[PDB]
DNA sequence: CAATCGTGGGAGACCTTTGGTCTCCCTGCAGAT
DNA sequence: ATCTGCAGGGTCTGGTTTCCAGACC
DNA sequence: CACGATTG
């Protein structure tokens, strides 16, 4: 009945689907940090864990998380940060009682027919709006594709289908 | 009082110092994982959380953790893994109730007079043997430097000094 | 704040002290015992 | 099982597959 | 994707 979806990146999000069909999606909490004398964004460990502790999803609920798979052409910092986000979320989810299933981007994109798209981010928001019409206003912006990815991971995990 | 030290990497370890002077150190739990058709060690998230939950250190105890600082010349996989281990430990520690204080390796090495050695791993084990003589048997092997780093991080936060 | 674009990048602590100097890991995989 | 050495590296799902093709942040 | 930077 309950399913969680997590886009773990800095502009990512967590989506919670209840058995009555309602849904919530939360932007990933972050803070601004100093590194090598510049500012950078970092996930907010305590707010994530606090977020997970107030969810109504019971222990045992499966959380489907986007598998970390950076391109070899991405910088060493890209690799560090996606590795870090992944581990922070995985530990946080496990410590808060949820079962964690990593899902490759190719898996849920094939499942919703999103593969090989020229506008993959827009498409993911369009698909999330169709599957979660009451979230349509929370998906209007280009920067909301993180919210879309989370909802689509949860929708994948629940076995939802597009019309 | 109570202090925790964490070497977060795959051969790392967590050390726990109690107020009566006694000490425990545990090797970091790991599992073997298939990745891109080869086998790789990865930290064991469940076992880490379970270990933290069995510690007698009370809530709010400070956990000193080695800051992740990979070299610009380490490969992107190096960056991903150290980022991943760091995030996994930080979240496990916050979620289990401990305060987290990252410590740069240069900080506890300067504190114990270990800067600029040509056998830094052996030296770290030697220093932790002197600080924790009842752990001397658990530091015999060169692969035990991670146990030594965890113990020294904890010794740093407790303010211990070498004779 | 929201978008977009192009390339892929250390970070840290203390000093010489408002910028300079110098220090620091680890992963992943072959091979030897 | 422990260690030594050395350069710094994608990974993943469908292939009704035996390593390939194509795909992804 | 992250990391900078620019542009309304």
Numbering used by the authors:
A (entry chain A), B (entry chain B): 109 to 271
Task: Quote the authors verbatim.
The structure of MOC1/nHJ complex in its ground state was determined at a resolution of 2.0 Å. The inspection of electron density map confirmed the depletion of Ca2+ ions, which were replaced by water molecules within both active sites. These observations thus suggest that the active site configuration has been reset to its initial ground state following the depletion of Ca2+ ions.
Holliday junction resolution is a crucial process in homologous recombination and DNA double-strand break repair. Holliday junction (HJ) is a four-way structured DNA intermediate formed during the homologous recombination. Canonical HJ resolvases introduce two symmetrical nicks across the junction center by functioning as homodimers, and exhibit strong structure- and sequence-specificities in HJ cleavage. The RNase H-like enzymes, including RuvC and MOC1, typically feature three or more conserved carboxylates, known as the DDE motif, in their active sites.
